[PDB]
Structure 1
């Protein structure tokens, strides 16, 4: 009875006050404490050693209290801890144990979700140091780590990295490393105000499954020249992806170093997202070094329906090897994306591209094939000389382009001098529309500049949609490039006044299995005979031509040249025209030259 007042005011008080849901006689006879025990928050562990609550703030290190919360819920089989709204909770010290080797602050645990409604901020303890805010490994060595399963971070809250710069290039910084992560996700959270290597990483070298990042925001996560490299989300487990997210940088350094997403394992996706101020959109890469959990192949890779303003390359494809393992990249789709290179001087950032091959130092280890690039839009402003639909800078075993709209300086490019890629199965369908923004800016340049060691089993069907008489050629193959079993065509529309349409500096268009067609101007002379009369070319450069036809009107009454032509063993063209009256004729005509097509 005095006992009772004391019990009630004690910490066991709520366990003595009875409750039945809505006065329902059929419901469980409980105590208030039992209903309160259905939820848990940071407030339930944010206390001094005497149990008195501590208010968070800039002079309070909340880390041990959040850890205690996570540890405790973990011991009961899991649940969701709320990080309350209306407060900022500062983190002020490293964690201990298995996450120490990852510079971890907080250790995540299986089945323990965090509902971040308020704000998590890093204290100046972390200035110029490494850190990884949330870590799901439980060992300093990931190979000896257990898994993290069924861990979800969500809510309307914020992770703020406090604006501190990296102290040294070699340091790493992360928001969430799920670790060897199975059914883990981040949803709704804003990550902001940092200089970090990543915001979120998913999986570890192929170990993991079903990890996702959805409806998150990533804002200003690079701020210094010390930051060596940044990729906002690194996807290193299969069956995993990024969807409906927003990424934004404002630093100059971001334009040169930052990528929004890494897809590095099979059945991974990047969709429906908006990117601004980044160097790169996504790398789609199989690293042999990361092939332990899910094999040596990256397949079923999807980059779709994204919106981007970048300064470098939108999608970068690659693979590589180690002494003992070969990585392979195949079965990739890149579709529906609308991308522009932001306003910048030519050459002021890494070379602008929709697709780049990919990635490395060396360019003779890649195995990339069965890639489909379809129904995308790409735009670079007219002054950006270093803008291409594809910069094909390393070996390529296949990539197919259909029904894209590319409006930039080059369609296919690689720098001469540099690498000599071996190219197979490059398909550029006629349904790719080449825009006009760069018209008149192409003096000395080849629209398709095929600076390769070799090209085989490839299709390039060039279709202009406006004039550009500044360009040197539509497509040029240097003498060093071998060409075989390929189809190269230049549609005549908008080409009438071009000196060079297609150029084969080693006369590669003569190969037995090269199928070509392109316009050329040809001078022809007839014999004098009245009636049906042959016309022959004055030059002897057409031994390769299977047929040609006129692309010019005949201003004459008294005669007509042939509508169509074949060739002769000496390299002349020949056709039969008609002299109404006799006389030797001499004409200049625009022809479509054809070989095996």
Structure 2
């Protein structure tokens, strides 16, 4: 009778409870208090209500989905995925998420506290899957939003180690969808071959989505995998912080990127990356411009630690027939990055910053400007010929480098013959320290190899801090590169023994608004006059020089060459020296040649 009610599922609803025997507290039943929390256990049962234990040969999907659906009906709450158990997912979800190869449909206000482990069963071997999907429709253009959905805890999402069946397939952990105020915190995503672990937003739709204190371990494992970017941030006001990214597979060194930032006001900070090809893409893709507009601005990549095999930060923008993408107002700072131990050319070209062409290779679609790269450290082993502070392979409308430390093969690089980027507002401040790891490795190479269509409104202030006499030059402009309204200086320190310092193969330094200084060795001859006496350069290629001054001591007693020189119409330098005793003098002097500076 009463016994029957008590042993029934309604029993706890008949056992009274008052918080700590407080007479002022609500008189409730045990069931009410138990109803304040909810776990997978409360839905992980057979049609008869008997609990099912999870494991290898149990598909937890439908039970988890029921839990999510039921809590969604009550306006939200948090479902615990209990510790001490692994909950295997063994089938595709149905309805709206079936188009996304979804396993589980996330729902608004329904949080998952994942304390235990979630593993994909062999069913998903060689198949595409997106484990959690916040889209409510197969077509995301027609999907509703996912709001206030947080996945967090000390738990694990394990992708079972299965390889991709085909390169064309997609795999994700959490596809939040058109996602507003959603986050993933504390979760370890491990043991997979996936396209992404997490995607935030959809073509700019979404806001305030974050990945914090998560771990991403060994999420590429096959040559089948076309591409990996662990977190793809595709909504504004969103980002990644204090995360850990690690790959061991050789394939990851060629295809894997830790983060992509694709919308405005997004960030990547305080994270550690190891074994990846790439740190981050920072890009406005025209195709993703619907939600938040055509401009990726306020892009922050800060205070990260990376060992990568390719490019740390890749800037881009591209266009569609109808929309043009723009990237501006980017800051890259405080990052300490190195190219991991590898053979030259054995992975994509090493670079701190890459200005990349779009996905179809186009290098004349880009609109990237107002980028500040500052207070970063970059290092590549001496052997890694393909390493650069910046690989500038596409049109650049501005990039500012200040107070960085770059210890790699090239400072500014682009391959000759390939793209011919149009370059505006490239600023390499003199405060960028050029490291010495690659000294004596630069035979035939130009430290700044300005392989561009044109350079305008740019500053290159070259400052060495050690000798490298192996390099062909500190900076070289091929005749094909136009240079105008630019400042190019090579500080004399450690350059005394250099044959070429700055090289302008088309004599571009003669430009009306080109401001240059660099050291050169010059032969001079004087008239025989006793007293104040002119010295002239034997060669006549200094028509562009506004002043020059000596960088050599004068070994002689009976005379001295001029300390300072100007030029003459015929291209000679001319200065006034002093013959204590008369006689024609002939000397070879190291000069700082200067034009308008």
Deviations 1:318-368 (A, max 9, x none): 001000000000000000000000000000000000000024110000000
Report the 3-state secondary structure (helix = DSSP H, G, I; strand = E; otherwise coil) of the residue aligned with 2:45.
Answer: coil
Structure 2: distance between partners of 1:15 and 1:497: 91
Structure 2: distance between partners of 1:131 and 1:500: 57
Deviations 1:362-381 (A, max 9, x none): 00000000000000000000
1:75 positional shift: 0.2
Show the counterpart of 2:24.
Answer: 26
Structure 1: distance between partners of 2:316 and 2:181: 27
What is the number of equivalent residue pairs in this alignment? 595
Deviations 1:89-138 (A, max 9, x none): 00000000000000000000000000000000000000000000000000
Report the 3-state secondary structure (helix = DSSP H, G, I; strand = E; otherwise coil) of the residue aligned with 2:4.
Answer: helix
Show the counterpart of 2:341.
Answer: 343
Structure 2: distance between partners of 1:251 and 1:265: 30
**Partner residue of 1:224 out of 222, 237, 240:** 222
Structure 2: distance between partners of 1:388 and 1:559: 47
Q: What does 1:76-87 align with in structure 2 at a 5 Å threshold?
A: 76-87=74-85
Q: What does 1:107-506 align with in structure 2 at a 5 Å threshold?
A: 107-360=105-358, 361-506=361-506
1:41 positional shift: 0.2
Deviations 1:460-493 (A, max 9, x none): 0000000000000000000000000000000000
Structure 1: distance between partners of 2:3 and 2:280: 64
Deviations 1:531-577 (A, max 9, x none): 00000000000000000000000000000000000000000000000
Report the 3-state secondary structure (helix = DSSP H, G, I; strand = E; otherwise coil) of the residue aligned with 1:164.
Answer: coil
Contact 1:61 1:93 in 2 (8 A): yes
Structure 2: distance between partners of 1:399 and 1:338: 19
1:527 positional shift: 0.2
Contact 1:316 1:359 in 2 (8 A): no
1:25 positional shift: 0.5
1:16 positional shift: 0.4
Structure 2: distance between partners of 1:21 and 1:322: 63
Deviations 1:133-166 (A, max 9, x none): 0000000000000000000000000000000000
Contact 1:546 1:567 in 2 (8 A): yes
Deviations 1:39-92 (A, max 9, x none): 000000000000000000100000000000000000000000000000000000
Report the 3-state secondary structure (helix = DSSP H, G, I; strand = E; otherwise coil) of the residue aligned with 2:70.
Answer: helix
Report the 3-state secondary structure (helix = DSSP H, G, I; strand = E; otherwise coil) of the residue aligned with 2:208.
Answer: strand
**Structure 2: runs of 5+ lacking an equivalent:** none
Deviations 1:397-446 (A, max 9, x none): 00000000000000000000100000000000000000000000000000
Structure 1: distance between partners of 2:188 and 2:269: 18
Structure 2: distance between partners of 1:33 and 1:529: 114
> Alignment RMSD, CA only?
0.3
TM-score after normalising by structure 2: 1.00
Contact 1:463 1:490 in 2 (8 A): yes
Structure 1: distance between partners of 2:27 and 2:552: 97
Structure 2: distance between partners of 1:296 and 1:90: 41
Runs of 4+ in 1 over 4 A off after TM superposition: none
TM-score after normalising by structure 1: 1.00
Structure 1: distance between partners of 2:67 and 2:427: 56
Structure 2: distance between partners of 1:293 and 1:317: 20
Show the counterpart of 1:509.
Answer: 509
Deviations 1:2-21 (A, max 9, x none): x1000000000000000000
Structure 2: distance between partners of 1:551 and 1:281: 43
Contact 1:218 1:247 in 2 (8 A): yes
Contact 1:273 1:306 in 2 (8 A): yes
Structure 2: distance between partners of 1:393 and 1:33: 65
Contact 1:155 1:188 in 2 (8 A): yes
Structure 2: distance between partners of 1:555 and 1:485: 39
Deviations 1:510-549 (A, max 9, x none): 0000000000000000000000000000000000000000
Structure 2: distance between partners of 1:185 and 1:218: 15
Report the 3-state secondary structure (helix = DSSP H, G, I; strand = E; otherwise coil) of the residue aligned with 2:532.
Answer: strand
Report the 3-state secondary structure (helix = DSSP H, G, I; strand = E; otherwise coil) of the residue aligned with 1:151.
Answer: strand
Contact 1:317 1:356 in 2 (8 A): yes
Deviations 1:218-250 (A, max 9, x none): 000000000000000000000000000000000
Structure 1: distance between partners of 2:356 and 2:571: 42
Structure 1: distance between partners of 2:554 and 2:404: 38
Structure 2: distance between partners of 1:173 and 1:255: 19
Structure 1: distance between partners of 2:363 and 2:420: 8
Report the 3-state secondary structure (helix = DSSP H, G, I; strand = E; otherwise coil) of the residue aligned with 1:5.
Answer: helix
Contact 1:447 1:473 in 2 (8 A): yes
Deviations 1:183-239 (A, max 9, x none): 000000000000000000000000000000000000000000000000000000000
Structure 1: distance between partners of 2:451 and 2:540: 27
Is 1:98 aligned to 2:68, yes or no?
no
